Design a protein around this ligand. Sequence first.
Ligand code: HEM
Ligand code: HEM
Ligand code: HEM
Ligand code: HEM
Lengths: 146, 146, 141, 141
Amino acid sequence: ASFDAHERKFIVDLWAKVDVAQCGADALSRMLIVYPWKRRYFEHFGKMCNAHDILHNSKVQEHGKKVLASFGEAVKHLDNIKGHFANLSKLHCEKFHVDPENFKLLGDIIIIVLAAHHPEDFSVECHAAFQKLVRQVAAALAAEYH
Amino acid sequence: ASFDAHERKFIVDLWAKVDVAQCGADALSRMLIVYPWKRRYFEHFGKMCNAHDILHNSKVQEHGKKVLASFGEAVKHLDNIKGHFANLSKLHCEKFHVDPENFKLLGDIIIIVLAAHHPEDFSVECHAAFQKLVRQVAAALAAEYH
Amino acid sequence: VLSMEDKSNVKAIWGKASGHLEEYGAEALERMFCAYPQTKIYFPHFDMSHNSAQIRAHGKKVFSALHEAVNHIDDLPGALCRLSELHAHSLRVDPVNFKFLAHCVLVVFAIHHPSALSPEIHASLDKFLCAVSAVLTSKYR
Amino acid sequence: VLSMEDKSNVKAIWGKASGHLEEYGAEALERMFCAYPQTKIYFPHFDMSHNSAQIRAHGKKVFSALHEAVNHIDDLPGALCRLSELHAHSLRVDPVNFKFLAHCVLVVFAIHHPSALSPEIHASLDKFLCAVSAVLTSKYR
Ligand code: HEM
Ligand code: HEM
Ligand code: HEM
Ligand code: HEM
């Protein structure tokens, strides 16, 4: 489903206030703490035995930034989300072997991090616009699995 | 995702052998037995206290036929499944108040009924073609919810 | 299973919703209706306006039940038993919708108490809401 | 919770897979890989050919574990305890994939024993596979 003009202005206006590095590091760290078995993907980054380790792991913090910077390019491709993520979708499947259910889990965590960092902008309708965005980013990234 | 030519020939060739009335009655009856709380939608059809009641309820058997006859029209609209189901999607939401998760549950049951009635045709690849069909019919019927 | 540490984490974050059960329950509800609009099929008799009396009265009931659950977090099944029955036999809500609400509850605590809802406490509260959803669904078949 | 009637239903349908544990486990697997291709990310080291030795040996192991579970259907947690640990700590498969397999197991029984897999028995077997998935997932956090 396309984004109406209202939905687009919620997404565009908020995204311009987001600190992508800070938020990206927070989202990935929260995912690894709330769902510990997802640490299977990142055991090459070093110590991740507990939450203190995860939050002090510099390679996790960097990966969370580049994940959220990539998600944020959806905001300038709102008409063409499937097409923009298609190569990234094939890398997840063929090279990194990431279970595609993870895309909807991280999406839900990103919504909690946005809520905590922008409480005054993250109204009911702003939230509903982001929930749609996160849904469509998850489906684009799951698309090329085979 | 479109259906390639192989997927289309699995779906078209099998569908032409299906007894839609028999299978449709079986799928709806199985859904109400395997997930008993879904009987909330059909309490105007009469006695449904147990499995014996459900299988002897004539109005349930008829509704299962018209549900599967409608699903089967997907097979002649394989390019345009979202568009073909859009009015039916709005009726489910606005008039019948049916939770859209039910569309994926019935889809999975329809696959079990097709397997039991056509064991020799319902190969691994035939199954994968139907699983895709059932997925896209569920999404079309969930589309107009709001 | 909820650990001793999980249980203390949940009691601590939940003591911040004290005095705000109606306010926070009504917001979680409004968020669920707007972000997961399919959930409105269960409330056709409700006025869906912001801050409607119905949405306030129900938000309060839901959060009050969660409060009882926190105070009896050792025996969730005995605390949620009547509600478990009610959802299985009368309301008959598909189990998948309990995750939508649980998510909306996390969002409301992230808005009102961002610094309290740390990554470790978020993990404990997520576990607690799953355990509550599992009890509410346990009598369905 | 599995009732006495559910337990007898499951023991009866499952006694039909006797002598066919490898055959049926390999088919359920092939069905899962083909119908839910995302599940192949967990088996990158496998040959995915029909009837490959790997897919046969694993299909057998999976069905053998289900057989032990049927024979100990009173205490699923004590029967699946080592497997529960293995999936939580080493293999670490997302819980959502256990439903895909469970569905593919129903399909295989519907192909080989259509008349045995009646609506009432289908309901008991569906409950049993959920209860097994729930034990396999119980130690994840
Ligand atoms: C919105 C969700 C996601 C986006 C936009 C995203 C984007 C990316 C990007 C841009 C990369 C770098 C790819 C490259 O090197 O060219 C990447 C790598 C990777 N991502 Fe994701 N990702 C997402 C979700 C996830 C999740 C949820 C996981 C695991 C839980 C994950 C696991 C990986 C792994 C393992 C790599 C490779 C890391 C490495 O070995 O260096 N991704 N992702
Ligand atoms: C593939 C899935 C489905 C299809 C293709 C389908 C199609 C239909 C059709 C064609 C009708 C008749 C509409 C009319 O009167 O104009 C209908 C009605 C209805 N369907 Fe569905 N349906 C599906 C799934 C379900 C499920 C899973 C449920 C409930 C579990 C359900 C509940 C209803 C109800 C309650 C009615 C109205 C019945 C009545 O009051 O007479 N549908 N559906
Ligand atoms: C933590 C999760 C939940 C809790 C603690 C909870 C608790 C409650 C409580 C306390 C009531 C009032 C019962 C009474 O008045 O005795 C109730 C009623 C109800 N619940 Fe739930 N509930 C939860 C999840 C859900 C979800 C996810 C839905 C639907 C999406 C739902 C639908 C209903 C409905 C329709 C009513 C009746 C509403 C009315 O007509 O006033 N519940 N629930
Ligand atoms: C009823 C559900 C399941 C049962 C009873 C089950 C049982 C088993 C058993 C018996 C093994 C062999 C362990 C050993 O050799 O000691 C195993 C290994 C494994 N299981 Fe599961 N399993 C189930 C579901 C799943 C699912 C859904 C997945 C992934 C989608 C999965 C992925 C694996 C993997 C990757 C291995 C290791 C495979 C290898 O490298 O040879 N399991 N499982």
